[PDB]
């Protein structure tokens, strides 16, 4: 739908670097119908050498297909439309397992809100939103500011729509370092891991 199938990718490169490469090309070529990042979710499977780039639209997505064969890190990124694939659901079980997080939320009540801490206060709202939105669709975004000063407190609460990208964003973002602060990303609730 809004995901492109890119193959012939360089084994070794990060999803972050490849995503920025595409974002840059979208901007420089004039493929962007809006500022920021056209890519909503970057999901790269380097094991089987295929990636699905989910864009914020379909227009830009279709426009990005023009770069089929683009030179990246020595490789030639093949850009085609993905195959007809349906995620096999469960009847009273899981076909196998997939990932603990899907089909687990049967009720609207769901502890899915992420707490993002370890951020500097010079980061403006737009940047923070853009960053987090580039790893999946956000349903809720509230940045904690100081009521008197006006600046950010350096942390926010944000909940993603999809249940897959949320933990994947944690795996990537949580562990980074913004200046002298280490980026801490987890869910606001957390029952009891003790790990």
- For every residue of 131-165, DSSP letters joined together read HHHTBS-EEEEEEEE-TTT-SEEEEEEEEESSSSH
Identify the CA nearest to 157 among candidates 111, 122, 192, 120.
Answer: 111
Q: Which of 72, 98, 124 is the last residue of a domain?
A: 98
One-letter-per-residue 3-state SS of 89-109? CCCCCCCCCCCECECCCCCCC
Residue 160: Cβ-neighbour burial (10 angstroms; 0-12, 13-18, 19+): buried
Q: Which of 98, 122, 157 is the last residue of a domain?
A: 98
**Is the domain of 172 the same as that of 192?**
yes
User: Could you tell me the residue range of the domain that residue 75 belongs to?
Assistant: 1-98
The runs of H, that is alpha helices, within the chain are: 15-29, 59-64, 125-133, 165-173
**Is the domain of 186 the same as that of 124?**
yes
**Is the domain of 126 the same as that of 54?**
no
> Which pair of tokens denotes residue 21?
């490469």
Identify the CA nearest to 16 among candidates 171, 183, 180, 125.
Answer: 171
Q: Which of 98, 113, 148 is the last residue of a domain?
A: 98
Give the total number of structural domains in the chain: 2
* CATH code for position 126: 3.30.70.330
């Amino acid at each position: 739908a809004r995901r492109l199938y890119v193959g012939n990718i360089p084994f070794g490169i990060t999803e972050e670097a490849m995503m920025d490469f595409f974002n840059a090309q979208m901007r420089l070529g004039g493929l962007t119908q809006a500022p920021g990042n056209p890519v909503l979710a970057v999901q790269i499977n380097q094991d089987k050498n295929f990636a699905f780039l989910e864009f914020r639209s379909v227009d830009e997505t279709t426009q990005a297909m023009a770069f089929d064969g683009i030179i990246f890190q020595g490789q030639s990124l093949k850009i085609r439309r993905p195959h007809d694939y349906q995620p096999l659901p469960g009847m009273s079980e899981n076909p196998s397992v997939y990932v603990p997080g899907v089909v687990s939320t049967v009720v609207p009540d769901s502890a899915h809100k992420l707490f993002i801490g370890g951020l500097p206060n010079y980061l403006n709202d737009d940047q923070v939103k853009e960053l987090l939105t580039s790893f999946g669709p956000l349903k809720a975004f509230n940045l904690v500011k100081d009521s008197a000063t006006g600046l950010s407190k350096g942390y926010a609460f944000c909940e993603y729509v999809d249940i897959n990208v949320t933990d994947q964003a944690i795996a990537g973002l949580n562990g980074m370092q913004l200046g002298d602060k280490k980026l801490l990303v987890q869910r606001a609730s957390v029952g009891a891991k003790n790990a």
